[PDB]
Amino acid sequence: VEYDLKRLRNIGIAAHIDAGKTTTTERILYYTGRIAVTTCFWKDHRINIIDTPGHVDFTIEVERSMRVLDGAIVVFDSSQGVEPQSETVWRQAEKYKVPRIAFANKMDKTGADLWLVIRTMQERLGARPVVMQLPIGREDTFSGIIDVLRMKAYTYGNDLGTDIREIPIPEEYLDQAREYHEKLVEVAADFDENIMLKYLEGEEPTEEELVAAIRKGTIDLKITPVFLGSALKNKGVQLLLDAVVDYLPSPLDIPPIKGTTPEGEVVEIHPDPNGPLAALAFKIMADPYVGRLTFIRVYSGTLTSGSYVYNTTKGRKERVARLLRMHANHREEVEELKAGDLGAVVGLKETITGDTLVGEDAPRVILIDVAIEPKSQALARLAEEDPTFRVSTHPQTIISGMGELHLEIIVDRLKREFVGKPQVAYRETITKPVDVEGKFIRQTGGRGQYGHVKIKVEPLPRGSGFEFVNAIVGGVIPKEYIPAVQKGIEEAMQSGPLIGFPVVDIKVTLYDGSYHEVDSSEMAFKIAGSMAIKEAVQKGDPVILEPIMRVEVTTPEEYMGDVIGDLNARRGQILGMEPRGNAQVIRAFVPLAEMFGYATDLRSKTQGRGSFVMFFDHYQEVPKQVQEKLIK
């Protein structure tokens, strides 16, 4: 019993709200429960159920939720096969190469038609779908379910699961089954030579050969078997499981994961238990008891309760208090989880998500600027988890960073859990080298001040930051003020001549000036300094730098034209593109500003079938035609 790395099946139920990703799990658990990562046994196997983001988009949450599991059961709404949403899920599973099966749920709701699913899938996703079971009864008749592999029926006595009888296929369907059973028999052929020869003689192949040949084909990604049923009616839930055990991948089925080692080079992280440990934190949930817990996934070696781990992604060392195992009904305190498994590690700090943990003996390996900003308690705890955003000064309340309205996630993880102007982060920098001077003669009253300096600001390559230099020879400006100067210069940078945005990519070279043996002061040289600047800037054909964007739109081949079109209107610079299995993806450059509410446009331009993504790539000027407008 206990554990065998072959008995492990780590899966997540990818789908949508409606499709039934929830009910579908609520039942599974109900069922495995008798006869953020809940685990439950089913027929000799440990099934780890890695809860999926399921909020449709918002990859980085979904990607982690992906690289972390092996299985995946894309469940569909049999009232409309491949609805737009679930496709994108697929694309996601698609992208990350996760082997997967399909569940035609709601097989009793009015529209319910298995083929509708089979038609679509083959069409929209372009998958090679195997039909695993036929249904008996139609929609709100849908009685039992057939197994075209073992050729055996199951009639469900009620919508509760307290009734269910194996029965021979009533002759009503007798042929239909005999038909698809052979199509299946066929498919296998393609994978197990041995099979075919039996196909061609009409020789019926062993149950294993099939079930096992078909499994090979799925883990290979060449196919996607299909099961059907009703979750909120108790029909099929069990079988769906059998499937999971039957054809989904255990950790060793999956290919070793690659890893960035310093010195470059990516490597093979085998699930060798007797190997040096390596794991990944993907979700953190503050628990009522025990508190902040970290769910992980062991990839190589073994982690034991009360041990030390070196989080590479953060240089900090951490001690693993105790370890836990989340069940539906009862947390499970344990002393260790081996390579391939995964669970919650209680007692940890400093460490986040997507972090890489190792063994203080083992090899240490690793597995944004926030261009958009709007207007105490809250941000401190919100800053605890989420190093993405940034509490910022700026001339008085400016959350700043990453994806549109993801900030609105921070806005609602605020005034809910605990405005406006979602605007582009612009910059200002000269383009031609200027030579200036600053001066500050005052009286302030009876105490006279004096501060006079001379600099030469230049255009720094985009990317280079700020560079402050000193040419001052033998004190013309006394060494004790120079820093003051550097301070004022550091203040002027704050609000650019043009539109008042940080100034950047500039080289300040202080080279002369003067002073009054006493009329000078610290406040004095910080002034002429934030003058010599604000001055040299507006007199240096200043510019407005905007965030050119790097985007990844995923359009099926169908609309891949008018997309490259609208996109091109976005002032974007398409630069390439590769195909993503069925559909094709396009990577370009699109000036952030020319991109808001893009989501719903893509939404409309493609029937709600396209999905993009974007990471800040860089800064570039903006033709006066844009600036002229931007200055209005």
The answer to whether 212 and 91 are in contact (CB under 8 A) is no
CATH superfamily of domain region 384-426: Elongation Factor G (Translational Gtpase), domain 3 (3.30.70.870)
The answer to whether 388 and 400 are in contact (CB under 8 A) is no
Terminal Cα distance for the chain, rounded: 73
Q: Is residue 516 annotated as involved in ligand binding?
A: no
Q: Strand order in 506-510's β-sheet?
A: 434-435, 456-459, 506-510, 466-470
The answer to whether 278 and 356 are in contact (CB under 8 A) is yes
Q: Is residue 519 annotated as involved in ligand binding?
A: no
Angle between helices 562-569 and 598-605 (to 10 degrees): 150
The answer to whether 135 and 107 are in contact (CB under 8 A) is yes
d(CA 376, CA 49): 37
Q: Is residue 19 annotated as involved in ligand binding?
A: yes
Q: Is residue 378 annotated as involved in ligand binding?
A: no
The pair of structure tokens assigned to 407 is: 């900030």
Contacts of 24 (CB under 8 A, 6+ apart): 13, 15, 73, 75, 103, 105, 231
Between strands 101-105 and 73-77, the pairing is parallel
d(CA 144, CA 230): 11
d(CA 535, CA 529): 10
Residue 597 DSSP class: T
d(CA 294, CA 285): 7
Residue ranges with strand state E in 498-630: 506-510, 512-514, 543-555, 576-579, 584-589, 614-620
Indicate the burial class of 156 (C-beta count within 10 angstroms; 0-12, 13-18, 19 or more).
Answer: buried
Percent helix, percent strand, percent coil in the chain, to nearest 5: 25, 25, 50
Return the residue matching tokens 């194996």: 166
Closest by Cα among 290, 210, 292, 211 to 245: 211
Q: What sign has the CA pseudo-torsion 218, 221, 222, 225? A: positive
Contacts of 289 (CB under 8 A, 6+ apart): none
Return the residue matching tokens 């930051």: 465
Q: Is residue 435 annotated as involved in ligand binding?
A: no
Q: Is residue 107 annotated as involved in ligand binding?
A: yes
Architecture of the 546-627 domain: 2-Layer Sandwich (3.30)
Residue 205 DSSP class: P
- Helices of type H across 334-374: none
The answer to whether 524 and 481 are in contact (CB under 8 A) is yes
The answer to whether 64 and 284 are in contact (CB under 8 A) is no
d(CA 218, CA 73): 12
Phi and psi at residue 398, in whole multiples of 5°?
-130, 95
The answer to whether 365 and 464 are in contact (CB under 8 A) is no
Q: Is residue 108 annotated as involved in ligand binding?
A: yes
The H or E element that residue 326 is part of is none
Q: Is residue 54 annotated as involved in ligand binding?
A: yes
The pair of structure tokens assigned to 97 is: 């190469």
Phi and psi at residue 507, in whole multiples of 5°?
-115, 110
The answer to whether domain 271-368 has CATH 1.10.620.20 is: no
Q: Is residue 21 annotated as involved in ligand binding?
A: yes
Q: What is the CATH number of domain 1-254?
A: 3.40.50.300
Q: What is the dihedral of CA 209, 98, 5, 285, to 10 degrees?
A: -150
Indicate the burial class of 525 (C-beta count within 10 angstroms; 0-12, 13-18, 19 or more).
Answer: buried
Q: How many other CB atoms sit within 10 Å of the CB of residue 404?
A: 15
Q: Is residue 161 annotated as involved in ligand binding?
A: no
Q: Is residue 95 annotated as involved in ligand binding?
A: no
Closest by Cα among 585, 588, 577 to 610: 585
Q: Where are the domains of the chain?
A: 1-254, 271-368, 384-426, 427-545, 546-627
Q: What sign has the CA pseudo-torsion 602, 608, 610, 614? A: positive
Count the residues in the chain.
632
d(CA 160, CA 235): 8
Segment 162-167 long-range contacts (CB within 8 Å, at least 24 positions apart): 164/238
Fold match between domain 427-545 and domain 546-627: no
The pair of structure tokens assigned to 377 is: 């308690």
Query: What amino acid occupies position 596?
Result: F
The whole-angstrom distance between residue 187's C-alpha and the CA centroid of its chain comes to 35
Between strands 165-167 and 224-228, the pairing is unpaired
Q: What sign has the CA pseudo-torsion 82, 88, 94, 100? A: negative
The H or E element that residue 95 is part of is helix 84-95
Architecture of the 427-545 domain: 2-Layer Sandwich (3.30)
Contacts of 255 (CB under 8 A, 6+ apart): none
d(CA 260, CA 356): 11
Contacts of 99 (CB under 8 A, 6+ apart): 70, 71, 72, 218, 219, 220, 221, 248, 249, 253
d(CA 377, CA 366): 33
